């Protein structure tokens, strides 16, 4: 019925952080 | 492009891949297949109901529609169910000006509650489609996600040209889930709309009749 | 610089694209269309208004009122669907002082629920596109970057300039889909709020009117 | 830091700040102007409660609202409306028991509609805010993020130190924006509950006095 | 591998990965034991009104069902009360039609909310695992990432080869929270529907039951 | 190692985590009381229905209730308050047996909603805290990849020694948010759920003692 | 009523391909 978007944010941010944090 | 990540992915990927495919097409089948049926229930109400106001006898609309005893669908069938009951209450205890009134209106509100029941079909299924396809779409992701990282960590290169294809096919999942899951979103409420107007139109219509058989109950 | 971005993009990004110019056309066409039925009946209704409370006697209105014949609208029509129904009852039936209260505000709901459903006439497709926009603009932006990423995977190594001109056509999508899903909202809010304004207005005028037949049938 | 990336922003993002200040500054004016009335609403009911169950006789408490006519606010307007219209309608027609006790409560129905309407003022632009809010902020960082993309696309062979304030500073508009979301929709519930529980209070009292006065017109 | 991984999790991961089991567990044992009670009273729902309808005096038919005392389920107990009722009360008082009516479809209400009380058990739990689970799972990946950091951070290798095992097995979480997510949501939304599908036909045959009994009511 | 990373974080993250620590703690006090008043109520009712239901005369029942007035809880209330109006308006006429019914029961509906009141008293804070905790962490990330992006763009070829305090302060945002969302989720539906089942006991009691005065009363 | 961050997906993706791009 209703769409949940907070866990695709949550993981997609962190692989973010950890993709900024690996190049220096 | 697609075929050749398609190919190169692992089992649970492409089990993924047909599940969702499988609800996108169950989906579209349900839509067209509930589409026609809700445009001729509303094309026939709005033909009776003109017939009803026409100026023609109850009687003679009553003897016409008896011969279609087991055909009957809609506003019809509310008003077959009330007069059978108000010419044999009638019959019995004429004397009571209240008894008949509710007699007439049980067999309307029964016919109306089955006619109501019989028009939403298979429509809590999209809601289901909606509801549970991103779930599998985010599990995609992360298992294609996983095994890069630990393909990258066995071997002794840090070079991101083995750890592209496979963020490149972990977000085919997500793609899918999005386009299984949106026009079942938009038929559910889409449909749920289309049946109120009808609720809306029988309950006018039932009332219109028993202001007109309160009128006459009482002279 | 967007005009080439939009030549430059393939098929499925164009068609995309269109589908929100389209619905943003729509959406403004209803708004417009909206905004002047709306505010002719709050004038409607509250001259109406003044005039009932002026102190002219109802034979005068109810004359008035035949004098244009059934083509009437708002209020007006409901100080028309009672009286007409009250007067009638109260030749017949006269022994049930209770029953012309009942058959009066039957025949008050009705008009009453017509007039209600004509004025929100679609609105709920603004809600349907305020909700729906999004979500189309993050797909067809996961495509082109998934494009990108399968693109960029061939060569072991790329500078940002043959990486740029992917995110400009990228995000050329979600920035239509929020233009085109802004007004919607408040649209929807407004034009609600205003109905809902226009029906406790009828409400409340259907309630006084009822108690003075209350008190003037039980003399 | 953050003033001078204002500074050096494009002008449309500069510009888009300022709605959502304004917006803020608004939603903090109608919540302080709110919170003031509905604690002395709460004050007045729970007094006139206390003093109408003390023990003194209704013909003084009437005479006494009566002395103020009309100009009266909640429980004592209800009070005051039931009580003159029982004692008008028993002067004429007491033939009936039931028709005073109908009357007495159509007539406190109609005087708690009008002042539930008036409780209600200038909530709904809370949610219109709380529900625009984002959109704007997401696109002004879109903007700003495809503008940077743009401008360094003319450059040849860059790298990332050039890029990273564009982000930067585009990334303030979604921080506002969430900002002046999210205590625009906290404060609607908290509104909405109280005036659910003024209402509770309101029809609480009404039964209790339709019930004393039913106990009155049936001997 | 995956064993590889969990071992080298810390406590509190660990800790987290046995509730997302244990929820699993508990969600498939109550999916089992409902579908079969769900089952035997929809067959039995379907047997009763064959023999009901058939056509038999209901006396014969009211004299067995006092053979299995305390031992009814389903429309069977609904009869027996609605039965049992009308005839205590029509041999004390004989006068008033309306009052044995009344009583007789008081009495079916509390039955019929009984038994949708009674099978209607567990599902709330079902609920709150699909609603909690994933909020869990990145909990406690974001909990071995910030671990992972930190250890990290000491040594003076930043390559990624020594990081890479943390990152992937700090990952199974989210999956497992997933997976025990989705069950949860599809059986519900079946549950719901099956018990939905149970009463409507409760309703109506007590509709038509009230029916069959104003007619003898009134001779 | 953790917490020195919060010691040299900027003072809005901090006020964040300020936020949510004091909703944390407001969560957990409303739960702890709630679980104890919800638990003695359920025993309270449990024992009067036992009471009731053994077989003692109902005029000791009333003397032991007005004994401990102004003590009464549950549904000792109701059997309190309908009771007391049906012997006040049989003495007064001794006709008319549908009044003393109908006023019978609205006494008893009035004291449901009291009792259902009271016991409904903290439950939508969780509910809120609940729904809101999330972007509050969101705000927070948001301002965390913002200094890093600044600091990775103020110095050329950047360390991780200067990019560590942004990805530090962005995790314990999230970390905090969910560990604050999580027990309240929880404990809304639990305590709904014991809501709902003292209700229908409520229910279930209150048409049992009507039924019994309304044989009685036509008798 | 509600917050609908939808689109914020759009804009991490696109950061995604920059440290795909010379970085790890």
Chains 1, 7 share one sequence.
Do not use: C
């Not at chain 2, 889930?177 to 559910?188: N, R």
């Amino acid at each position: 019925s209703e769409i949940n978007i907070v866990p695709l944010l949550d993981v997609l941010l962190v692989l973010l952080l950890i993709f900024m944090a690996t190049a220096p | 492009n697609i075929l050749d990540l398609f190919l190169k992915a692992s089992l649970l990927v492409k089990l993924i891949m047909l599940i969702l495919i499988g609800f996108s097409i169950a989906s579209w089948a349900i839509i067209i297949q509930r589409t026609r049926i809700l445009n001729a229930a509303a094309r026939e109400a709005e033909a009776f109901e003109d017939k009803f106001w026409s100026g023609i006898e109850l009687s003679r609309l009553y003897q016409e529609s008896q011969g279609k005893r087991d055909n009957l669908t809609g506003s019809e069938q509310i008003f077959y169910s009330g007069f059978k009951e108000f010419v044999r209450l009638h019959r019995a205890n004429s004397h009571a000006p209240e008894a008949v009134v509710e007699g007439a209106s049980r067999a309307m509100r029964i016919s109306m509650n089955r006619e109501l029941e019989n028009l939403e079909t298979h429509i809590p299924f999209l809601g289901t489609v909606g509801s549970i396809s991103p779930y599998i779409g985010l599990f995609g992701t992360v298992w294609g996600i996983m095994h890069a990282f630990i393909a990258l960590g066995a071997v002794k290169q840090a070079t991101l040209q083995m750890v592209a294809p496979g963020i490149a096919e972990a977000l085919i999942a997500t793609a899918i889930g999005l386009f299984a899951a949106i026009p079942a979103v938009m038929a559910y409420n889409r449909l749920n709309q289309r049946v109120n107007k009808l609720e809306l139109n029988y309950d006018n219509f039932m009332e219109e009749f028993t202001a007109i058989l309160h009128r006459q109950a009482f002279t």
